[PDB]
């Protein structure tokens, strides 16, 4: 409150509380910080080959 | 730089156009030239040096960048404002002749030294056709690519630079003079451009 | 290329000031003891206050007066700082904010404030006059740059002597130094500079709209105290109770009562530094003129 950054922390706290769980098959195609899935990579086996 | 005392005052006193062409004789730059013209009561003697092409560190331009600079010599010292005016006109011409797309991420520096400009009786109009013919000889000596030779001529203040045997105009300059003198001034410089064009090739092929 | 200050050192000096402590051991209103060392020729003055050492060189020459003031002489001054006083000064940077603010303060104190008699420096109106030059050499930097430089220039002008000139209508003959004894310059008042450094144990917000003034002000800061300084103030007074010039721009916005207090605290300082320069000049004169008691011509009768 003295640093006047209280509103910035509470705004980010809302985006954390607004996080939504979704299965990997029905996840959004556009990568978003609001949705989460166990698999968020288009081809997960590509990052294991490299 | 001494300049001496500031209490000192400077002294106050109360058809056919010969041409000379040379090139080289300079080891600092890549290509140089020297043009001299003596006709009626006016003589011209200026030296042109081309320091390039130099690769520019951190540049990412698609084509080259020309840098022309006219420097006052030792006689008939012009004002510095008009020297850079002719330089900007010289860059506007050579940006269409020099193959800029061949030298990416690099620039070309031009140094023309109007060493001895003398009048025996705007005065810079008569010197412009002599500066253009000195840079083309110096740019070709430096291995730089130019699309056809570039020359110019004088017709009472009006200076027009042609290219491709006078088929297309690359630059136009006029100061003082008169009115409605256009087609005659173009043909007076068109035949003068060809006089300077083939003379540059004759000097650049000798040994 | 700049001085690195550790967070531990920055916190210590601030808290020491909150306990009325200075690393060098002075008080919050104690000016550094000044020392004047006169050179060989006239106008060669070396000033040493604390670890800060400065050297001034006074010269003059014949020049053309200004077209708007043909009855006054010129006063030139340039304080170019070399890496000798510290490797943080890049050589050749004559446009530095410290060099700019130093010259403008001394120029206002000497020339504009009427310290040097410019009207007496006029030989022929609108043609020939004296252009006194003050070259200040910063030898060792430890704060108080414009404080010592102002003492050096004022001690230098009072110690310098200009060549004698005899006017024969329109001609001007500069008498050699061996021919006639040079004449000293005329000095009306003695401007002495006193700088003030300010600190706030709070922050900027508690200082803009805060009635409780918790600022800490110190007189003549050192280099380490200067690097941790928040607000800066420079006043210049003379022994005639006159404010020669004041320069306060930026830093902590202070109130009128504290700035007036800075002047009254600085007057007791400039009053003592004035009498020291008058005494050290008197002792240096007797050093050069040892047998001056026998060579007096204007003597009283009976």
């Amino acid at each position: 409150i003295e640093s006047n950054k209280l509103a910035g922390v509470l705004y980010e706290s809302r985006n954390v509380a607004k996080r939504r769980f979704e299965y990997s098959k029905y996840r959004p195609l556009t990568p978003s910080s609001e949705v989460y899935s166990p698999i968020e990579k288009e081809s997960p086996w590509k990052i294991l080959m490299y | 730089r001494l300049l001496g005392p500031a209490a000192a005052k400077p002294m106050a006193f109360s058809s056919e156009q010969e041409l000379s062409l040379h090139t080289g004789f300079i080891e600092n730059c890549n290509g140089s030239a020297l043009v001299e013209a003596r006709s009626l009561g006016h003589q011209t003697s200026l030296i042109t040096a081309v320091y390039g092409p130099r690769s520019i560190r951190g540049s990412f331009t698609s084509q080259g960048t020309i840098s022309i600079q006219l420097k006052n010599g030792l006689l008939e010292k012009y004002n510095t404002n008009e020297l850079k005016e002719v330089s900007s006109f010289l860059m506007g011409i050579f940006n269409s002749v020099v193959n800029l797309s061949r030298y990416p991420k690099s620039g070309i520096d031009i140094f023309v030294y109007l060493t001895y400009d003398k009048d025996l009786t705007s005065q810079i109009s008569s010197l412009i056709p002599h500066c253009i013919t000195s840079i083309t000889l110096a740019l070709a000596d430096a291995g730089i690519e130019l699309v056809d030779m570039a020359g110019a001529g004088e017709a009472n203040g009006t200076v027009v630079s042609f290219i491709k045997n006078g088929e297309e105009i690359v630059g136009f300059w006029k100061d003082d003079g008169d009115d409605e003198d256009l087609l005659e001034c173009l043909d007076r410089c068109k035949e003068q451009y060809n006089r300077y064009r083939d003379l540059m090739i004759s000097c650049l092929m000798n040994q | 290329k700049d001085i690195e200050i550790s967070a531990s050192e920055s916190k210590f000096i601030l808290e020491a000031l909150r306990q009325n402590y200075r690393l060098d051991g002075r008080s919050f209103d104690q000016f550094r003891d000044v020392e004047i060392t006169f050179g060989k020729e006239f106008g060669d003055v070396s000033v040493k206050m604390g670890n800060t050492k400065v050297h001034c060189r006074i010269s003059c020459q014949i020049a053309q007066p200004y077209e708007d003031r043909p009855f006054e002489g010129l006063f030139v001054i340039s304080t170019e700082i070399s890496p000798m006083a510290g490797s943080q000064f890049e050589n050749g940077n004559i446009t530095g904010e410290d060099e700019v603010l130093c010259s403008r303060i001394i120029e206002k104190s000497v020339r504009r404030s009427g310290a040097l008699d410019v009207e007496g420096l006029c030989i022929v109106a609108g043609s020939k006059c004296w252009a006194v030059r003050a070259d200040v050499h910063f030898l060792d930097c430890d704060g108080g740059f414009i404080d010592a430089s102002c003492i050096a220039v004022m001690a230098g002008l009072m110690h310098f002597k200009k060549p004698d000139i005899t006017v024969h209508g329109e001609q001007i003959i500069v008498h050699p130094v061996n021919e006639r004894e040079p004449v000293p310059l005329g000095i009306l008042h003695i401007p002495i500079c006193v700088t003030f450094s300010f600190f706030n144990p709070q922050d900027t917000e508690e200082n803009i709209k805060g009635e409780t003034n918790s600022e800490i002000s110190i007189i003549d800061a050192t280099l380490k105290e200067e690097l941790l300084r928040d607000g800066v103030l420079t006043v210049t007074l003379n022994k005639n109770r006159e404010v020669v010039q004041v320069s306060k721009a930026g830093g902590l916005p202070m109130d009128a009562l504290t700035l007036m207090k800075c002047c009254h605290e600085a007057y007791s300082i400039i009053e003592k530094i004035t009498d020291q320069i008058l005494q050290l000049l008197k002792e240096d004169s007797e050093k050069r003129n040892k047998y001056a008691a026998m060579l007096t011509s204007e003597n009283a009768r009976e």
Binding site: - | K84, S96, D175, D176, D178 | -
Partner: protein, 257 residues
């Protein structure tokens, strides 16, 4: 300006075609709306402030000084200062040397219209200040000095001794101020008064000076951009040159109003 090569080819293909489609759709003989303010500096004889459509703003001030014309060569000195650019910059001294030729004492403007006694005469100081610019401002300054010179008032002469001037009355400066126009050629089409994006992809540029209802001497053909620099047919030189002879009287009728 700075654009992408993707849109540079789009504007190049659209301005070189036979319809000659302009970006903003204006005709090759049309101009952009301009605001001009005059007479606002009491300490100066003449003054003018011009504002363009793209945001270019330029201020011109006019001062006077009595000087012996037998020892003073040029009586019309133009001092140009562009904000953000050095006084010794290459782009500043070119316009400074170019405007001194379009307003030369004797050539561009006759000295007889500012003479006083047979010995003394008035010297005109034209101070130019460019607050902002996005293209070549030589054509914008000409419009500013035009309205400034036509709104200038100098003290009246009272009459070999030193001249004396009246206290209240001041005479108007009756001077025909030359005008400067900028033309850009795109392949085979002429464009009068180009824009920041038109002049960036153009092939070459033309500068024409207009004085006393005719094309006067100081003209140039400087390139507007270092990227696309092409040589032009001589038939294009006379096309745009004779094109201003038809629409410049429409400019003066709207500018001298």
């Amino acid at each position: 300006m700075s654009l992408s090569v993707a849109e540079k080819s789009y504007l190049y293909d659209s301005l070189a075609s036979t319809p000659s489609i302009r970006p903003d759709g204006r005709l090759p003989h049309q101009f952009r709306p301009i605001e001009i303010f005059t007479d606002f500096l009491p300490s100066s004889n003449g003054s003018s402030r011009i504002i363009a459509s793209d945001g270019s703003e330029c201020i011109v001030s006019i001062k006077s000084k009595v000087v012996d014309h037998h020892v003073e060569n040029e009586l019309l000195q133009v001092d140009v200062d562009i904000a953000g650019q050095r006084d010794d910059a290459l782009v500043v001294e070119t316009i400074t040397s170019l405007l001194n030729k379009v307003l030369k004492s004797g050539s561009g403007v006759d000295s007889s219209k500012l003479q006083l006694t047979k010995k003394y005469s008035f010297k005109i100081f034209v101070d130019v200040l460019v607050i902002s610019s996005h293209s070549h401002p030589v054509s914008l300054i000409s419009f500013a000095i035009y309205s400034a010179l036509n709104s200038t008032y100098l003290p009246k002469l009272i009459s070999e001794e030193l001249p004396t001037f009246h206290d209240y009355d001041m005479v108007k400066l009756d001077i025909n101020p030359p005008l400067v126009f900028i033309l850009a050629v795109v392949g085979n089409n002429m464009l009068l008064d180009p824009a920041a994006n038109e002049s960036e992809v153009a092939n070459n540029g033309l500068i024409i000076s207009w004085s006393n209802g005719k094309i006067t001497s100081p003209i140039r053909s400087v390139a507007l951009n270092d990227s696309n620099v092409k040589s032009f047919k001589p038939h294009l030189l006379k096309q745009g040159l004779a094109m201003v002879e038809k629409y410049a009287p429409d400019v003066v009728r709207s500018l001298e109003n």
